[PDB]
């Protein structure tokens, strides 16, 4: 036995020496040296200093550049807002708590920081799915005589919020729960304890199938059809050097988007699957945060891939950052 249970938490450290304390009441310097909490605070500072400007500037240039306010760009703005939910609802709170050594805001603040951190990551998750669906519908033209408009773009954003609420609200009402994870400074969905009072097992399964398998299949199918459509069109039009460049660029971006999506959620998939299955084991609190590293950093590199590598957005941002001329 290598954990300590409480009414609303689970510290991954044995209490056979009597030093384990509540993560809501006292610093947790027995599961990690104080400098590791400082490095945890240092990494939260990095995500804030990089994640906020790049994501805020995306909303700013859209206000300034009329050509960016198109329906196909709504879901990109929804991506920037979701990243900001991760920055302020999660990153800033964790920077604060890590400087204390424990989660100072108690169980109520744990549900708050856990709801908005899960909501932010899920909106960004499903925004990448909706973006693939729209790009597949627009380019592959799978429906007969259909034009993507403003009402379809709004429903695409509303669909992400509904999927995120269908993913962060259940822990607040008794399906799974929010508890401090790893070094006990940030809160998330419980998959380290089989808390039968809230049915953690059926939620983790519903979490894995509906909110990871379904998104992964949809993204692979849509972008798979897109690369097929583009390569087919260019093959039937090899006299156009521009169409040959487009086929290469589109293929290169699809590989980058799919690989980045895997780097984001696959470590969180397997490592949390192992912690869930091989439960009650001697999970290092440092080992807990290995999947959280790749997923949380997506608040920084999703804007780089989906905004900064977009020609229309990058030109408007260079103009705005360079005082108005470039």
């Amino acid at each position: 036995m290598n954990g300590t249970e409480g009414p609303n938490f689970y510290v991954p450290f044995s209490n056979k020496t009597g030093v384990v304390r509540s993560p809501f009441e006292a610093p947790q310097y027995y599961l990690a040296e104080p400098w590791q909490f400082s490095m945890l605070a240092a990494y939260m500072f990095l995500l804030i200093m990089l994640g906020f400007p790049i994501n805020f500037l995306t909303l700013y240039v859209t206000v300034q550049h009329k050509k960016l306010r198109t329906p196909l760009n709504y879901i990109l703005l929804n991506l920037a807002v979701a990243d900001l939910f991760m920055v302020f609802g999660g990153f800033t709170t964790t920077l604060y708590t890590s400087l204390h050594g424990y989660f100072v805001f108690g169980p109520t603040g744990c549900n708050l920081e856990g709801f908005f951190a899960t909501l932010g990551g899920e909106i960004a998750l499903w925004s990448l799915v909706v973006l693939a669906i729209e790009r597949y519908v627009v380019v592959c033209k799978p429906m007969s005589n259909f034009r993507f408009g403003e009402n379809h773009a709004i429903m695409g954003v509303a669909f992400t919020w509904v999927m995120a609420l269908a993913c962060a609200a259940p822990p607040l009402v008794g399906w799974s729960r929010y508890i401090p994870e790893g070094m006990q400074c940030s809160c998330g969905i419980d998959y380290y304890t089989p808390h039968e009072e809230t049915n953690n097992e059926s939620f983790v399964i519903y979490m894995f199938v509906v909110h990871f398998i379904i998104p992964l299949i949809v993204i692979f199918f849509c972008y798979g059809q897109l690369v097929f459509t583009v390569k087919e069109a260019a093959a039937q039009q090899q006299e156009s050097a521009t169409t040959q460049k487009a086929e290469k660029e589109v293929t290169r971006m699809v590989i980058i988007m799919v690989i980045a999506f895997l780097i984001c959620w696959l470590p969180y998939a397997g490592v949390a699957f192992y912690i869930f299955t091989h439960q009650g084991s001697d999970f290092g609190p440092i080992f807990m945060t290995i999947p959280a590293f790749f997923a949380k950093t997506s608040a920084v590199y999703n804007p780089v891939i989906y905004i900064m590598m977009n020609k229309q957005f990058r030109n408007c941002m260079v103009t705005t950052l360079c005082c108005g001329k470039n």
Binding site: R135, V138, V230, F313
Partner: peptide
């Protein structure tokens, strides 16, 4: 497809 690839920000 060149026009639709620009609309979705892929080219």
């Amino acid at each position: 497809i060149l026009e639709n690839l620009k609309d979705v920000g892929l080219f």
